[PDB]
């Protein structure tokens, strides 16, 4: 219903905390007043979306008018996956068809996958952080509506992994590792860090070929492992899949540093 649609729109609006909406006058926009359509014209979708929301989120506006605008926003966005659309248009600054499709793809994927699989999808995206935060909001919204505990497990599990990537992206300690790499790309190093987290069953054999994957300059292969131990020791607990995952990873790097010292 329209009545519950407004509530879902406001519920989605509280998941995002767009300053765009708060900065907005509303008073002097002229939206008051009442039967409205597309008076906005030339105005970009993202801006009409935020402006409508500014009214929906209003502390003084009557619920009768909020309903009229709610239906209108539902026409602007597509009736299918409008929730995701709303979250996208508010969540992303420069939102283009490449982003809309990607976000939609990532979401349908989540609704049927490791932390690298997720990173590799969002890797080359403008405001990739933002694109990812959209899916997180969407999934956490859906979670409160799921019947199946199996769905609940899958859904919450993805939320953890997506937030994990968000934490990984938010860091800049790899500068010294990026320095010693041939390609000098942050993403190639970042990919490797995620692989070590993915490889819960970390083997001495696998870990030993780590500077070869990231193409670390010759001789500087031991130093790499020293920086790696330093890196994993520095990470927040949220980054690890298990409590013993830190302790085991650091043991392994230490075991490898010790093995290389004789050869
Ligand atoms: Br179940
Ligand atoms: Br699962």
CATH number assigned to the domain comprising residue 201:
1.20.1280.80
**Which residue reads 């659309």 in tokens?**
85
C-alpha–C-alpha distance, residues 197 and 246, integer Å: 9
The radius of gyration computed from the CA coordinates of the chain, to the nearest angstrom, equals 23
Cα of 150 vs centre of ligand 1, distance in Å, is 5
Ligand 1: centre distance to CA 111 (Å): 15
Residue 147, token pair as written in the block: 């019947």
48 CB contacts (<8 Å, ≥6 apart)? 40, 76
Encoded tokens for 228: 């790696």
Ligand 2 centroid to residue 19 C-alpha, Å: 35
Supply 146's token pair. 């799921």
How far, in Å, is the centroid of ligand 1 from the Cα of 154?
11
Report which of 170, 175, 262, 180 is spatially closest to residue 224, judged by C-alpha positions: 180
The pair phi, psi for residue 57, each rounded to 5°, is -80, -5
Experimentally, the structure was elucidated by X-ray
Cα(152) to centroid of ligand 1, in Å?
Answer: 8
Spacing, Cα 180 to ligand 1 middle (Å)? 49
Q: Distance (Å, rounded) from C-alpha 231 to C-alpha 212? A: 18
Strand, helix or coil for residue 67: helix
Residue 148: nearest ligand to its CA? 1
Cβ neighbour number for residue 120 with a 10 Å cutoff: 13
Q: What is the DSSP code (8-state) at residue 242? A: S
Which of 121, 85, 91, 93 is CA-nearest to residue 106? 121
Element (H, E) at 167: helix 149-169
Nearest ligand for residue 157 CA: 2
Could you tell me the distance, in angstroms and rounded to a whole number, from the CA of residue 173 to the centre of ligand 1?
A: 41
Q: Measured between alpha carbons, how far is 16 from 131 in angstroms, rounded to an integer? A: 12
Q: What are the backbone angles phi and psi of residue 140, rounded to the nearest 5°? A: -70, -25
**Chain-centre distance for alpha carbon 23:** 24
Question: Ligand nearest 154 Cα, by number?
Answer: 2
Alpha helices per DSSP H over 172-243? 175-180, 186-198, 204-208, 210-213, 221-234
Q: Which two tokens stand for residue 23?
A: 């900065």
Supply φ then ψ for residue 181, to 5 degrees.
-90, 145
What's the count of helices (H) and strands (E) in the chain, helices before strands? Answer: 15, 0
Separation of CA 54 and ligand 1 centre (Å): 39
Q: What's the 41 CA to ligand 2 centre distance in angstroms?
A: 45
Q: Is the dihedral of CA 180, 186, 187, 189 positive or negative?
A: positive
DSSP-based three-state secondary structure for 181: strand
- Which residue range(s) make up the domain with 187? 174-261
Ligand number, closest to the Cα atom of 149: 1
What value, to the nearest 5°, has the Cα angle with vertex 252 and ends 247 and 256?
150
DSSP assignment of 99-157 equals: HHHHHHHHHHHHT---HHHHHHHHTT-TTHHHHHHHHHHHHHHHHTT---HHHHHHHHH
- Which ligand is closest to the CA of 153, given by its number? 2
Q: How far apart (Å, rounded) are the C-alpha atoms in residues 226 and 180?
A: 12
């Amino acid at each position: 219903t329209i009545e519950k649609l407004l509530n879902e729109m406001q519920e989605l609006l509280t998941l995002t905390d767009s300053d765009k909406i708060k900065e907005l006058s509303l008073k002097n926009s002229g939206l008051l007043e009442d039967p409205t359509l597309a008076m906005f014209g030339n105005m970009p979708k993202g801006e009409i979306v935020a402006l409508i929301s500014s009214l929906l989120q209003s502390k003084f506006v009557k619920i009768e008018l909020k309903k009229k605008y709610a239906k209108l926003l539902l026409d602007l966005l597509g009736e299918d996956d409008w929730e995701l659309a709303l979250l996208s248009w508010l969540g992303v600054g420069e939102l283009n068809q490449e982003g809309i499709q990607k976000i939609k793809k990532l979401y349908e994927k989540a609704k049927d996958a490791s932390l690298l699989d997720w990173f590799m999808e969002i890797k080359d995206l403008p405001e990739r952080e933002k694109h990812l935060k959209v899916i997180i909001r969407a999934l956490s919204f859906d979670l409160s509506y799921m019947s199946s505990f199996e769905d609940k497990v899958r859904t919450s599990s993805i939320i953890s992994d997506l937030c994990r990537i968000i934490i990984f992206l938010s860091l800049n300690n790899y500068t010294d590792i990026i320095a010693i790499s041939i390609k000098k790309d942050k993403d190639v190093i970042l990919n490797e860090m995620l692989s070590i987290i993915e490889h819960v069953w970390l083997t001495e054999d696998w870990l030993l070929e780590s500077p070869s994957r990231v193409s670390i300059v010759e001789d500087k292969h031991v130093y790499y492992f020293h920086l790696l131990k330093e890196f994993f020791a520095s990470l927040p607990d949220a980054c690890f899949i298990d409590n013993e995952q830190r302790s085991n990873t650091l043991l392994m790097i230490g075991k490898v540093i010790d093995y290389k010292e004789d050869v």
